[PDB]
């Protein structure tokens, strides 16, 4: 169905421990496909999915140069940020950027993204219009003024409507065996008595891709959202993900509870129960 491509930058200063580190990772949906780390050998953009290995030397040279240039640019940006927030050169700080595009089933742009953070807080964001900016504070407003003056939004829009979607479409075709395959969750409910009076029912979802999933417990048909323990969806290490949802239920009432599972790989939402 719908797909995304996102690049994620992390630039981290470390006073007394050399120049700021710059890392880029690229994803299509929940699949890492390229990485760059300025602390490497030998820093280069490196493939992390088989389908990107098809790209020729020109691709890799260009992608590496972009990242090597960015390493320098973001060191400058970290120095500028100190000035914008009246901070000393003694402390460690982080700039992050995430940008990319979503496409629909027909491959057309659904929306574009470009957003930055400083020390884990929103800094500046390209608006959905791909023409204006939202600055989080008076520091980011200085950057906004610079970017408005240079018509940066217009350049980004050109990329997001063009190369972003064009390359993503190519990746989806080259990786169609995996990127265009949903793996539904394998599901089961486990039973763990806490006491004579109460038991834990845990609804498991394993081996699914992509990561998006909904697990919900109902008691007599009513969602138990406030009373459910939901763990963060977690990577298995084989591309797939795992998740569980747990409720504490009175002993002898287990059959009043039903777990409901929604995932792209399922033809319809699934309902399951404790099966002793």
């Amino acid at each position: 169905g719908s797909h995304s491509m996102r690049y994620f930058y992390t630039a981290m200063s470390r006073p007394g421990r050399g120049e700021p580190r710059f890392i880029t990772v690229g994803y299509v949906d929940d699949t890492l496909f390229v990485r760059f780390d300025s602390d490497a050998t030998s820093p280069r953009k490196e493939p992390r999915a088989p389908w990107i290995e098809q790209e020729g030397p020109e691709y890799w040279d260009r992608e590496t140069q972009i990242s090597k240039t960015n390493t320098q640019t973001y060191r400058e940006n970290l120095r500028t940020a100190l000035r914008y927030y009246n901070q000393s050169e003694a402390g460690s700080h982080i700039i992050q950027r995430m940008y990319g595009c979503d496409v629909g089933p027909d491959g057309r742009l659904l929306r574009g993204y470009d957003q930055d953070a400083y020390d884990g807080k929103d800094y500046i964001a390209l608006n959905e219009d791909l023409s204006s900016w939202t600055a989080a504070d008076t520091a980011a407003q200085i950057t906004q003024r610079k970017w408005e003056a240079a018509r940066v939004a217009e350049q980004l829009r050109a990329y997001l409507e063009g190369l972003c979607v064009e390359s993503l479409r190519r990746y989806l075709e080259n990786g169609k065996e995996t990127l265009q395959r949903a793996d539904p969750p394998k599901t089961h409910v486990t039973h763990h008595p806490i006491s004579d009076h109460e038991v834990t029912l845990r609804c498991w979802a394993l081996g699914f891709y992509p990561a998006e999933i909904t697990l919900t417990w109902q008691r007599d048909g009513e969602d138990q959202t406030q009373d459910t323990e939901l763990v963060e969806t977690r990577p298995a290490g084989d591309r797939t993900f795992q998740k569980w949802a747990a409720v504490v239920v009175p002993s002898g009432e287990e059959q009043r509870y039903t777990c409901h599972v929604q995932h792209e790989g399922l033809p319809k939402p699934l309902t399951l129960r404790w099966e002793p």
């Binding site: 990242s67 610079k146 350049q155």
Partner: peptide, 10 residues
């Protein structure tokens, strides 16, 4: 494929 925006600085 990445974008490179020349001269874009904070």
């Amino acid at each position: 494929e990445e974008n490179l925006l020349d001269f874009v600085r904070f």
